[PDB]
Structure 1
Amino acid sequence: ASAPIGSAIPRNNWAVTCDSAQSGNECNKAIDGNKDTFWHTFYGANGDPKPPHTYTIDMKTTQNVNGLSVLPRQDGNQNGWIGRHEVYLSSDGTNWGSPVASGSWFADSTTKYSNFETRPARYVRLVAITEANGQPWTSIAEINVFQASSYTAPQPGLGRWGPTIDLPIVPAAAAIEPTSGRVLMWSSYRNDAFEGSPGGITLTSSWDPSTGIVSDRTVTVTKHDMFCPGISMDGNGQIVVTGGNDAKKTSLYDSSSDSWIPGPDMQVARGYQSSATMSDGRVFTIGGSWSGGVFEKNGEVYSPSSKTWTSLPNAKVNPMLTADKQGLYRSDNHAWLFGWKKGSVFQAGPSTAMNWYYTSGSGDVKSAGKRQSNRGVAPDAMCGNAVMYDAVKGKILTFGGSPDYQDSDATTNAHIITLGEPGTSPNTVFASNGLYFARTFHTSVVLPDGSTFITGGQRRGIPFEDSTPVFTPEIYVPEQDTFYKQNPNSIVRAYHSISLLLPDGRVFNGGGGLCGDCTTNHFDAQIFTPNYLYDSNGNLATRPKITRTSTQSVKVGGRITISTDSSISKASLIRYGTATHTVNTDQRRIPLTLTNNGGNSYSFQVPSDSGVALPGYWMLFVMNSAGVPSVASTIRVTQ
């Protein structure tokens, strides 16, 4: 099932009202504690008024509300399930503001939850915008509201969490659809379970930041259950999703047509491998013993032009293996891969040993030294994160993780790796004094200003369990070499969580769980709004506008000229992201050197090396003197 983040508020003295209710199915039957009695809107002789339908609770006194739950009818009747919905809170019962949560619940009779940041409130309203299968009615057997143990206002200047997006699946994998700006998400053959899959099916869901609409879709055309896969956006602008529950399959997601297309089978069956887009737009992958067998799985490379996978048996996985106690099943998982110059791929971890991978001929691998600092040699950091926040200077920030995949203490370890040419050993140093909070299974994104946002995880890695959670996110600021705690959230985001940068500059953070009949499935996501979007008074700041671009598609080395509605101080290109199991090999950031043409007209060059400016879709952000970013303009980079 799932679970709330607080404890149920006693309903003895509640007063409730509904937009309509059938005799015998009164509004208060939803709060009588009897699973066999239910509220039901008008039907039969009363006519069949269509949704939206509304349930409003007066709890009589202020509670620190952090969620609600809906128990559907228990008599096998399926016609009142709530689909699209919104949750509002109020202190007077008349002014409701914006929803604290909204989205879509899956069509079944399981208990449904909305979990969200604690907010003091006396009144609670649930709006059923649609019935789950489009019928006229709404029904509820039991509704509950949950409270936190306490409430603390967010600190000024440290960002803001909310709202919650309620989903019909657990989003354990996700990507931005660059042409549409939507968030694409998927689970497995079921909405919350991968176990005992017959393969050939993936449940997907998308969220549109511009409309708030959650959609869903069942993908069978690629004959691929895409749980536990490699993910890369290739040079042809298609997301290459590899292996996992169907360990040899390749699926291609095309943003332009919003459709899935069969790809060629991989040469080697894999799960939990990392893949990385290359300087020439191809995709390299290596490792992955979660599925398809446990043995040495060396590299292979996908060509979008010839639609083939080709084995690179001499791109040896052996040098990048961690010393995981469980052995090869884990030790070749989730490599920290970055496409780099001349078809090379850098492997930054999680193993202590870093390596250069090469893709010419039958492949090759060369030692790049140990991840280390004056504090010592860095231990294996399975499910730590790695983020290329300045591709032009070859800067990679790595942090967190634990020596073993599970039942292992996470660390605060963090490093800056500075890449030069392939085949050279990069300089590595410790990053500041490391993380505030040791964490593994955390996720991260590079932000427009070059800072890295770090969120979720737990201190001791225990998949499917929400123990030792870390609720306080951190931001690394390179020019100060300092980490900063941000405002905390209240939903655990550990194993099977994801984070992505949205085109509007906010962070989308979600998932966790995906373990069938477990209590730790999170059918939701939350928005984090960074401090750079707020003015000194905590109101949303005015953002600069890009009013023109000379072109929206550019070859590496090419220039773009833009016009803005105000003066801008900085700009950056950020490659669109993909995420699962802590891995995001697609995001990276290029700080742009601007030429000022005067009159708020500016130009810049895209770097000429496609190992730096990896082909694909990028976000162009400009920032004013106050540090406020524009929303992204989408740029296609070609090689």
Structure 2
Amino acid sequence: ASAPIGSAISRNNWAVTCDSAQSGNECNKAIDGNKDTFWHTFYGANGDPKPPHTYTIDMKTTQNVNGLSMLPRQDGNQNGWIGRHEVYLSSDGTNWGSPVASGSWFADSTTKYSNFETRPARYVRLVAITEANGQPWTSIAEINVFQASSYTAPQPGLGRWGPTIDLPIVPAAAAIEPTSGRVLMWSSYRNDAFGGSPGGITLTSSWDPSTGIVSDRTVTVTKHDMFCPGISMDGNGQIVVTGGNDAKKTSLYDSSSDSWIPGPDMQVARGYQSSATMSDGRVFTIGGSWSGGVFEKNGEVYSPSSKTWTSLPNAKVNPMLTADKQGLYRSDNHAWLFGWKKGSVFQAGPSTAMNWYYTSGSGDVKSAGKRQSNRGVAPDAMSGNAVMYDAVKGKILTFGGSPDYQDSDATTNAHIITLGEPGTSPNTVFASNGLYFARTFHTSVVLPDGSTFITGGQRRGIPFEDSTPVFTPEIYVPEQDTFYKQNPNSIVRVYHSISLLLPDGRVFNGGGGLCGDCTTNHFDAQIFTPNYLYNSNGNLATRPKITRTSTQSVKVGGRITISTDSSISKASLIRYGTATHTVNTDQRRIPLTLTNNGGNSYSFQVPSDSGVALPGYWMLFVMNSAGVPSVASTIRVTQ
């Protein structure tokens, strides 16, 4: 079940207009207050008019709209369930503009929602583009429009939230498909639940930024229910999805062919582990006591070339365990892993103790000291995020989290960890004065300019409950060592939420929930457009364009020559991300040292060390004098 952030508006003086309506199933039948009566389009008489089918509402007066509900027909018939749709808002009548919400709803009889940012409007319009099973009809039992307590205009210069992407599933896990630019998302065996799973099935969904289309696919070929996994993009360009509900399995997502192919079983059955891509393109994983048993689960490595998993039992999980009250079940979860030089993997936390993991032979571990500063020793920070914003200088920003997985207060603790060579204890200092808001279950992404966008979460970690939410996102700016509050959103993004950087420089933030008949399932996502895409007038700024590239595929140490349409000041390489349960071990940023060839022609070198420039797919962004980035050019980095 689900959402809607506000209170229902009075349906007394409402004037409703439909494009098609039968006798006995009129347009006004969707606002009467009965769940047994319904609106239905032409069937039998006047033939069968195929969708788009429109439902326009006139609320007579200006209301602070933040959502809508659509209750399907409750008579047991499927004819009319809305699939693809769009929600529009207006103040006059024929100046709708862009949709405030768009996407696809699941094929069932449950109440569907479209939750979006507050915007004053008099007219609301629900366009039903398709029917859930491809039939010509559209039927709504009850349609309600929701309102917020008040409207506060978004502050100029602090970004913008919107539109909302309505989804058929709760996106508890996600990844960008680099070759196509689409967002791949997945839930479990069901769209809203995981408990009582027979295994072997994952419901996936995708969203295309260029088309706006949301499609779904049932994945059974890999015999893996991919809820609660380790996720990593290997050097061969495939997403390694490990364990979870089906603890011993591995699933490989290939972006170029848009398909899922079976991977070899892991040596140790895991759930909630973090996996990290290494310097040689291999994938390292450790811990994960959510599924497959609760015991000491040491490291293991995946080789893409041989298609094997090999145990590294001496890469001990013991030194990275948090002091979690629930014990080993939680203490080895969601490690802040980063692939580094010479096959090593840095573990930045969540435990106070940081460690170096080695992958040669049967593995090894060496203490990297405690995450600390002049303010003291940093406590365990489960569900705290870690972002490598400057891989060349080995800079990692860590923030938030709580001592225990649940029933624990989040903190404002933030640190900057500076990596040196493997085996050396990194320097750690506090980041500014920490976060503005204490948050756990929050998500983050590194932006083109080196800044880290932090969003969602709650002050006290209570899974599946939308209590003590943080609506105001923050951006950390390294050059200034300062956090900045951005414009707030209206949707709670707590446990099971995700954030990914899109190729267009915007942030995709979604999910939260996945508990079944609970009221906290968020079958959606929202787009955050940062300030760097806006001019001083509050309109979308002119973006510099990468007119030509010498090559799309490059080896570490190699050069790329580009041509632009205007002068460039800075450039960056951002590794494509993957996300689940606050973990994103794939994203990282490399600031590029540019050589000006003149005539808007620039050259740069991809770092020689594959521990910095992790093999895989990367986003090339160029920034002008005003700081406005281009859309990304997809670059494949090999060894």
Coarse TM-score class (shorter-chain normalised): over 0.9
The whole-number CA distance in structure 2 between the counterparts of 1:250 and 1:310 is 13
CA apart distance, 1:188: 0.3
Per-residue deviation, 1:93: 1.5
| Cα deviation digits, residues 164-223 of structure 1 (max 9, x gap) | 000000000000000000000000000111111100000000000000000100000000
For residue 600 of structure 1, report the CA deviation from its aligned partner: 0.5
What secondary structure is seen at the aligned counterpart in 1 of 2:532? Answer: helix
**1:534-590 deviation digits (Å, cap 9, x = unpaired):** 000011000000011111100000000000000000000000000000000000000
Q: Which string of whole-angstrom CA distances, capped at 9 and with x for unpartnered residues, describes residues 229-264 of structure 1?
A: 000000000000000000000000000000000000
Secondary structure at 1:396's aligned position in 2? strand
Deviation sequence 1:463-510 (CA, Å, 0-9, x none): 000000000000000000000000000000000000000000000000
Deviations 1:278-321 (A, max 9, x none): 00000000000000000000000000000000000000000000
C-alpha deviation, 1:3, in angstroms: 1.8
Distance 1:310 1:460 in 2: 39
Per the alignment, residue 56 of structure 1 pairs with 56
Give per-residue Cα distances to partners, 1:577-628, cap 9 Å, x unaligned: 0000000000000000000001000000000000000000000000000000
Question: Where do 5+ consecutive residues of structure 1 fail to align?
Answer: none
Rounded to whole Å, the distance in 2 between the matches of 1:81 and 1:543 is 40
CA distance in 1, matches of 2:60, 2:521: 32
Shift of 1:77: 1.0
SS at match of 1:518: coil
Instruction: Give the gaps of 5 or more residues in structure 2.
Output: none
Question: After the TM superposition, which of the residue ranges 430-439 and 6-15 deviates more from structure 2?
Answer: 6-15
* Aligned position for 1:46: 46
The CA distance in 2 between the partners of 1:544 and 1:4, in whole Å, is 39
Q: Distance in 2 between matches of 1:591 and 1:212?
A: 31
Q: Which residue in the other structure is 1:446 paired with?
A: 446
Alpha-carbon distance, 1:44 to partner: 1.0
CA distance in 1, matches of 2:547, 2:27: 52
What is the rounded CA distance, in whole Å, between the counterparts of 2:523 and 2:549 in structure 1?
39
Aligned to 1:393, what secondary structure does the other structure show?
coil
1:121-270 matched pairs, under 5 angstroms: 121-270=121-270
> What's the counterpart of residue 4 of structure 1?
4
Report the alpha carbon displacement of residue 13 of structure 1 after superposing the two structures with TM. 1.2
Distance in 1 separating the partners of 2:615 and 2:37? 58
Runs of 4+ in 1 over 4 A off after TM superposition: none
Provide the rounded CA distance (Å) in 2 between the counterparts of 1:131 and 1:552: 40
TM superposition shift of 1:12: 1.1
CA distance in 2, matches of 1:551, 1:122: 52
1:434 aligns with 2:429: no
Superposed CA offset, 1:298-357 (max 9, x none): 000000000000000000000000000000000000000000000000000000000000
Q: For the residues of structure 2 that align with 1:418 and 1:628, how far apart are their CA atoms?
A: 28
User: How far apart, CA to CA, are the structure 2 residues paired with 1:249 and 1:597?
Assistant: 50
CA distance in structure 1 between the partners assigned to 2:248 and 2:412 by the alignment: 36
Supply the distance in 1 between the matched residues of 2:3 and 2:144 (Cα, whole angstroms).
Answer: 12
Question: Counterparts of 2:259 and 2:108 in 1: how far apart (Å)?
Answer: 26
SS in 2 for 1:146: strand
Deviation string 1:118-147 (CA, Å, 9 cap, x unpaired) is 000111000000011110010010000000
Within a 5 Å distance, the mapping from 1:583-598 to structure 2 comes to: 583-598=583-598
Report how many aligned residue pairs link the two structures: 639
Mapped to 2, the partners of 1:436 and 1:358 lie a distance apart of: 36
Q: Does 1:101 align with 2:101?
A: yes
**Residue aligned with 1:329, SS:** helix
1:71-108 CA-partner distances (Å, limit 9, x unpaired): 01010010100000000011112211110000000011
Q: What displacement does 1:47 show?
A: 1.5
The offset of 1:32, in angstroms, is 0.3
Q: Distance in 2 between matches of 1:129 and 1:546?
A: 35
Secondary structure at the residue paired with 1:55?
A: strand
Question: TM-score normalized by structure 1?
Answer: 1.00
Q: Distance in 2 between matches of 1:256 and 1:442?
A: 31
1:582, 1:184 → 2: CA distance? 16
| Higher mean displacement: 91-100 or 369-378 | 91-100
Counterpart in the other structure of 2:380 = 380
Task: State the percentage of identical aligned residues.
Answer: 99
Q: Distance in 2 between matches of 1:266 and 1:516?
A: 29
- SS of 2:622's partner is strand
RMSD over equivalenced CA pairs, Å: 0.4
**In the aligned structure 2, how far is the partner of 1:207 from the partner of 1:623?**
26
Q: Distance in 2 between matches of 1:185 and 1:166?
A: 13
Structure 1: how far apart are the matches of 2:255 and 2:47?
Answer: 43
SS in 2 for 1:367: strand
Give the deviation of 1:46 after TM superposition. 2.7
Q: State the Cα distance separating 1:512 from its structure 2 match.
A: 0.3
Deviations 1:42-90 (A, max 9, x none): 1112311111000011111111000000001010010100000000011
Q: Tell me which residue corresponds to 2:404.
A: 404
Q: Secondary structure of the residue that 1:46 maps to in structure 2?
A: coil
Q: CA deviation at 1:421?
A: 0.2
SS of the residue 1:445 aligns to: strand
Partner of 2:604: 604
The 2-side partners of 1:9 and 1:458 are apart by: 28
Q: Distance in 2 between matches of 1:286 and 1:52?
A: 50
- Partner SS for 2:597: strand
Distance of 2:3 and 2:73 partners within structure 1:
18
In 2, the alpha carbon distance for the partners of 1:254 and 1:74 equals 40
Alpha-carbon separation, structure 2, partners of 1:262 and 1:79? 37
Deviations 1:381-429 (A, max 9, x none): 0000000000000000000000000000000000000000000000000
CA distance in 2, matches of 1:251, 1:329: 23
Give the superposition deviation at 1:21: 0.6
